[PDB]
Chain length 334, copies 6
């Protein structure tokens, strides 16, 4: 409870734009979402995506059962109308009386990017950004947004699953395992602008990771001397202490083939991981877990996370340094 609080300073995806537009016949929302156990409502007021606590100030009805009416969100119960800043500007029963000062609900940072809606619950440290998706605005690439998949596992466990290759022989023997390259060498890892960066070579191929902390992964797969660029972007929304809503976007240079060739393969990979990751208990990794040399990526990830957690208690400047100070191990220049 105390230990998840620093996660409120990051931007997290809560839904696709498609899900918001399908939520209500108007295509404007409202849509109820949950983030870090907070009940929120998302709507499009004018040209602005807005996110508020899903709870009217008057008698606590859920705004997510209400209606968007121009530049206002209208509560279903007695019709109070809230503006983009969460302040009531119309009490229909008392339309000439002054509106109480307390007639306001909490409003949160809310922004569309890459076809997802992102929410940042706490902006007080002013140093976090929506994660990096390298394929955005690259006209060589066809971009496809998959439907979200829900797992009974935490965002940390899902991240460590995504960036590990030790498990291919046992979970993915027919899909991702390469029998002639069964053990990946330890690779150098760099911290730069709040991202982990690391690259694996075959050099016939290349797996280039840019991971915006804490839960987003951008993987570029290129074949050298060939035009086979494939990008996977995966980000987990920490819905509550046990549950993730996960988003996978993929982009590809060679787009003459079917989208569903890649979707079916990706779904097979996910279905192989899913029961094993859901079995991990307790849901958060305890201090007694035993690491080996091949676990470099997750060891370093856990190391960074607890630095961020300690820096959050020390305040805005400690946190900004912990997040954004470079730490270079490789030969690359940034």
């Amino acid at each position: 409870n105390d230990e998840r609080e620093y996660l409120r300073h990051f931007w997290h995806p809560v839904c696709t734009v498609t899900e918001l537009e399908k939520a209500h016949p108007s295509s404007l929302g409202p849509l109820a979402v949950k983030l870090l156990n907070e009940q929120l409502v998302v709507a499009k007021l004018g040209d602005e995506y807005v996110a508020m606590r899903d709870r009217c100030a008057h008698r606590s009805a859920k705004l997510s059962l209400g209606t968007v009416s121009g530049n206002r969100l209208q509560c279903p119960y007695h019709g109070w109308q809230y503006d983009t800043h969460g302040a009531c500007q119309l009490v229909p029963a008392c339309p000439n009386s002054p509106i109480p000062n307390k007639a306001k609900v909490d409003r949160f940072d809310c922004e569309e990017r890459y076809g997802l809606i992102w929410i940042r619950l706490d902006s007080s440290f002013d140093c976090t950004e929506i994660p990096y998706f390298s394929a955005a605005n690259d006209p060589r690439l066809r971009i496809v947004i998959q439907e979200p998949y829900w797992w009974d596992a935490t965002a940390e466990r899902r991240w460590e699953n995504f960036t590990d290759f030790s498990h291919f022989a046992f979970i993915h023997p027919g899909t991702l395992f390469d029998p002639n390259n069964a053990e990946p060498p330890i690779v150098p890892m760099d911290r730069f602008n709040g991202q982990f960066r690391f690259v694996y070579d075959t050099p016939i191929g290349s797996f280039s990771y840019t991971c915006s902390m804490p839960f987003a992964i951008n993987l570029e797969v290129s074949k050298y001397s060939s035009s086979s660029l494939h990008v996977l972007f995966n980000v987990s929304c920490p819905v509550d202490s046990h549950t993730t809503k996960n988003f996978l976007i993929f982009a590809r240079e060679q787009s003459d083939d079917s989208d569903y060739l890649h979707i079916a393969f990706q779904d097979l990979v996910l279905a192989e991981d899913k029961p094993v990751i859901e079995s991990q208990w307790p849901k958060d990794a305890p201090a007694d877990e035993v690491s080996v040399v091949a676990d470099k990526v997750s060891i370093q990830y856990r190391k960074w996370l607890r630095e961020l957690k300690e820096a959050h208690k020390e305040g805005s400047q400690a946190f900004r340094s912990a997040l954004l100070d470079p730490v270079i191990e490789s030969d690359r220049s940034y």
Copy 2:
């Protein structure tokens, strides 16, 4: 539960007579019911309706899985027989041994009225009565008891919903909303014999409310110089901290039409209310809720409940004064 102890002193409805008769083929019960989170069992023993704790004194089996045999409720496990006062009168395994003095279960006030079964858990203040239903013993009126309806909402929030008119335009636009009277004014409210009394007029008819504290509403709808008296009697059973079992009885002078004309309209109104009331959270009204002048009825209701809660803690005489002292705002003379 500390905060709802004072509710144990009121009469609460727990089932209809029909539900009790239908529970078991005997037609005498037993029927399990829950009131203020207490598990009770109701039965008809001889000519009397009885309510007991649903827990055998011997080995704690549910008496509600037992059998009514004349004027005994027989436990299903070892067949101990309990009389109308909750005292065991037969131990079948030791039929000539004396029955231990501890072989009794708590027995509560239990009375039929208007075709409902009513239970008062604590009679020690001796100053509460079954709520007032004005159509009873009026031979001009046909009386119908609807089937009970369960809501995931508290009795307080249900009462506030029933007595509010600000919500009609938004929840009931095509059923109850009157655009010829879109904002009923604030009215005088009287306290008299433990009831709230208040009337709303046309601007030719009237809505006359007699509300027996804490959870019953008697509403007489008249149209002037017509034989068109309609009466709605609604009462919420506070089952536990998040649930109500609700009862609606209605009476009408004009009785040549179908009962189901009124039931289907009343059910449609209830269905419009239900999702919004059940969305309200937290279940009990917290202090941060924001009232406006049009909430007079709700504000005064919350105030009286607070007074009853405080007076209960001060004892029998304080509670009795808080409940039955008259407080008149209108020009009426009772």
Copy 3:
């Protein structure tokens, strides 16, 4: 709560051998089980039945989703292999590096007996044994292991239901109730070798002899003289958590030319009659306000003994062993 602590010192059944062999196509397990709210995994590793915590030391995946390979249990995630002592012997990703010292999981005493798998979670007092079943190794008897049955009731309440007959007229009027024998009298009860022993004679030429291995096992021998028709029932509850039991019934009979299903149907009917009443008892553990009568002697004596065991366990190994194994005889019988 902490009042269950002393129960970890006994052997409890967790599954049938059949359940273990059906769990996984290899017929070696693994199988997940739960005992006193502990999540365990059972597998057949070589010629041994082994019980471990169902949690890999590396990244906490469930070993019960993995595979037996040779004499080892292999985790489904990164393939660490654990031996019969719970120690990791292979890290596939680092096959030449040294295996970390803490690469191990807790292991528990585990044994097959009578076609059930038994686990003891705490062996430090070392004074308890697997319950007694009188029919094993008796070639006159056909033995049948029933499918386990799950009840939303504690093991103590289940034991008291099995040993009571006050309830026959009301729960079993058409199955077990005998109208010409409605009141079995109170009988002497012996403590011996950590068992309750007590015998009901028929005055109708028979006998019901109970040997109840504390805390949750019951061996009932029925003799219908003067006939060669011995019938043995063996019932034991696994305390799965604070609310739930997984129950095992094994029955044996001398006259075994009739159908097994004649007996299984009858027993299943008896169990179905008991089930809703026992599951309705609340709260789940019997509080101090229950009102006993003279006919409840067996139940009263059972609760007194569990209370002694629970108090002796707080005073340590030697006190517990005396409470469990000291004899207390009140019948006229030899031992």
Copy 4:
């Protein structure tokens, strides 16, 4: 269907008044019903209960999905309005054009009696009446209408089951079987005004049957020198070749007890019969069935049905004689 044409001349119950009122929020219907495999729609238009074919004349939509508006049944597709005689009186698309003469649907006799809706599909023989229920207009008796019960069995097999006593020891050992009277003797049976009449005595009471052909049974149970008259009225609606919708009405002098005491006992009796009657196959009694002397009631029933079937084919006068000619076996004088 060739063999059941003669049944169209009788009055058959299709629903209770309650079912009709509950079908749609209007309380006026429409309700879809099926009789002798004909799809019909029932509605209350003005003061009249009407039955029509459930098939609009225009484009064959189901009128049962439409709306009752006063004294019109409105088709849901293009809104044609049908009056109480089945004639279209408004074509909304051509409101001043004349309505084609073919714009009518077949309309059938439809009458309320005893709280049931009754339909006679063919009135051309003008010699059949709604079955006799002896307790109607007896002010000493409380009358209760049970909910209808559907069986996968024909109306003939249901009737034979209700009037047989040979089965009590085997289907009803603990409910109806009397070991003090284990084999009721064969009795005289009378034909009178289209009814079978027969009485069984004690060896102090009597079972007096008045059976209006073909599917109704009126059973008066008396105990001598007591005010204990019980009446059961049972009638099967022949829905199609393998299904009945059955109606049970019961009346009683002693009315201080619960209606549900009797309903639950009557429902238990029905539940004992149901699986055996539904197992009978083929659904219609073939010629190879083997009767014994104790089947007198069933044998004479089958004979009268055969005569009615033959007489129908010979025409109105033959059918009327076959139905209403008296055939007396008893010493009674009607």
Copy 5:
């Protein structure tokens, strides 16, 4: 019955391209479909969409449970491989023996157009084409293919529902009904190139222009002048069997900066309003006793033309082609 026979001569849609690619992880199919009670399989074999009878010639297994291998459809049972003409080219069990002459399955004309797969079961008259969709290859329009919807109603009854407006006040009172325009008058109807053409003007400055490719396809263009807000709806029913249609809706719009889901929700609501009424019509095919009024001209003309086609088909190829393609003009318009 045999009254459906003439329908085999037209092109009918059977699935979306999306449905075909999702069917099997290879994204090449195969996918089982049903058209006029024929069980077919569709697969992408090389650069061609191919339709065959979904029944192997060897032992009658369903090819739709098999696999595309190269440019061939391989049966799941014994692995016979069929080419784009339905001829077996490999018998894995007898790889050197000659392949039996009758080792082949029926194949059918199959083409992609507008993102749907179309099949013609009988090509012997060779005079029908794939229906016309006015929005294809118009770069001013955003085109959206909806998910197919299944109704328990025939394709003829579905077509008459789509082209009627008599029903708006009663089925669509809050969606399509216009209170200031409740009675669209009767309009002239043209037959041209096997299409019905007819146009409704607004006296409210608009236009509804129908091009209906017989028998079951409807292209509706809506112009809301004087604005650049052209909207095109294209609806076509697949007659799956005597009782059932699988329906495809494609819509196109010029103003495409709003959400696709604004339009999809509205259209889905319209369809949900129609569905129970249309499915309630009985019997499934309209009998001779239905009573028409003057407002039903479109429906009356539609049924007359289908009757001609059905009669011309019994007289052969040349008669059918004239019935389908002869012009019959009653408007004042150019063609």
Copy 6:
């Protein structure tokens, strides 16, 4: 319909003995079964297994809802009692009157063998036997009876699936396919005593088939010079024209391992075959199916079946010759 009639002359399994004993608490049945679209009832009367048409002669109730009472099967409706020959010997309602000659139901050959109940519907040709299971009464072998498995496929199609190896590469690539012996040679097949016999060698191993016509297969798998005998016995009950209830028995010499090792493997094999065989249509193999040289077994099977079918029309002696005349292709001596 006409074409399945010759199948009534063979013995077919309808249930396990276990299923019969579990059907009713008595362990004696009755159990309803279906064979070649006939509704039958099976019960144990004394020491005899009996099979009758599931239809009482009196009023056609199902005897399978009745009760075994010593040496009688008692109908649930009016309690008629049938003896082991299907003749009613007690009419409870008329216990002294002569029982009608027609009071009899059809009785069929019924016999236990190998833990299954077999029924022969037509014994008129007197030349068929219960199929051969080679492991019965071999004390070296542990015998296990699996639970029956139901397929939506005919008995002929299931038989041809069981005796074919062409399909291993495609249906069983991981279970039964042997990559170094991918094409089995054509083998000689012998007809002897109504069995097909044929043997496949590896000679390190051996698959020896004895197939009692028409639906039973006995497969002995032995490794030469080793004691690895494994027997599979599979027989299909032709329940109706589209459905089989299939029985698998297996026996093994090495029985120190778990029964469920073999059961799990066998279930995996069956689950691989099942969707492909259920897809075959039409359900019976038409004349247009195209065979290749590798289909010898099924070609010869289809050849024998149509010989039996033609011989059935020519009568008892033609059929006996067609079934039991030897036709030897191999070197073996019988």
